Structure 1
Amino acid sequence: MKLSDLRPNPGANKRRKRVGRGPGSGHGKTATRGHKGQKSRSGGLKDPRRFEGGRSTTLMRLPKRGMQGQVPGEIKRPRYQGVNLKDLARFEGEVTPELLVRAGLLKKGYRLKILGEGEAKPLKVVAHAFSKSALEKLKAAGGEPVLLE
C-alpha cells in the first residue's frame, strides 16, 4: 500500500457547486438566484426564520408564559439528575455519585436521584434521593439504599 493508492471512498469527498460559470453548467448568469427582487441581491432578505413581510409575526403573536426571572438572576438551589436502575446494571457492590459521574451517567454539579426504570440489582446505592418505585424495587431486589443529606 502506497501513497498513489490512498484514496477516499466514493462520496466521501464531493465536488462543490460553482455558480455563475456559464450556460452549460446549468448555473450561469443569475447563478440560481432567479430574476431580481431582494433575495437575488447581495445581502439578500431579512431573517427568514422570523420576518414575515411587515405583518405581526407568528412568534410575536403568541403569548409569553411563566417566570422569566429577574436581576440578579438564577436563584441557586440544589439540582437533581435522575439515573435509572437499568443504568446501574453495569456496576458491582457500591455505587455512588462520583462513580456515576465517571461512568458518564451522572453530570457534575448535580445531586443524584435514582429512578425506577429497569430492574434493581442487589447493590448498595448511595444517592441524594429515590423515586418511590426506585425505593420499592431496590428493597425487593435485596439492595441497600443509602440517602445523603
Structure 2
Amino acid sequence: GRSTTLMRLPKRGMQGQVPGEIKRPRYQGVNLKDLARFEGEVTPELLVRAGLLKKGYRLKILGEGEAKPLKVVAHAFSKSALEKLKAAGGEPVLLEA
C-alpha cells in the first residue's frame, strides 16, 4: 500500500533502445577440462555436435583442467588457457573473413 520496495534503483545502463538489440558475436566459455575428456582434434564442429556449444556463435576454450595433446580450433583462447595447450599441443585460432 506504501512505496513498494521499488525504492531500489536501476543502475542497469544500456537497458534498452528503440531499434532494440545489437547483433554482436557471442562467445561460449568452454573449459579445457571437459575438452580433455575426449581426444583427437577439437573444433567448434565437434563441441556443438555433442557437448557444450549449442549453436553459440563462437567458441573460446579456457580455464581449469589439464590439457591433452591435440589441435584445438577455437575463436578465442584465454591467456591462461593458451598456456596449458601450448605445453602439449597446437593453438589453431579462429577464422577471420
TM value normalised by structure 2: 0.86
Does the CA-based 8 Å contact 1:81-1:107 persist in structure 2?
no
Query: 1:63: how far off?
Result: 3.7
Moved over 4 A (4+): none
Q: How many residues align?
A: 96
Cα pair distance change 1:69/1:123, threshold 3 Å: same
Residue deviations 1:61-106, cap 9 Å, x none?
A: 4344321121110000111001011010222211111210122311
Residue deviations 1:26-50, cap 9 Å, x none?
A: xxxxxxxxxxxxxxxxxxxxxxxxx
If asked which structure has higher relative contact order (CA below 8 Å, sep 6+), I would say: 2
Q: Give 1:118's aligned residue.
A: 65
Greater Cα radius of gyration, structure 1 or 2: 1
In 2, the alpha carbon distance for the partners of 1:110 and 1:60 equals 38
Matches within 5 A, 1:39-50: none
Query: 1:145: how far off?
Result: 3.3
Cα pair distance change 1:99/1:111, threshold 3 Å: same
Structure 2 segments unaligned to the other structure (5+ residues): none
Query: 1:117: how far off?
Result: 1.4
What's the C-alpha RMSD, in Å, of the aligned pairs?
A: 1.7
Structure 1 segments unaligned to the other structure (5+ residues): 1-53
1:81 match: secondary structure: strand
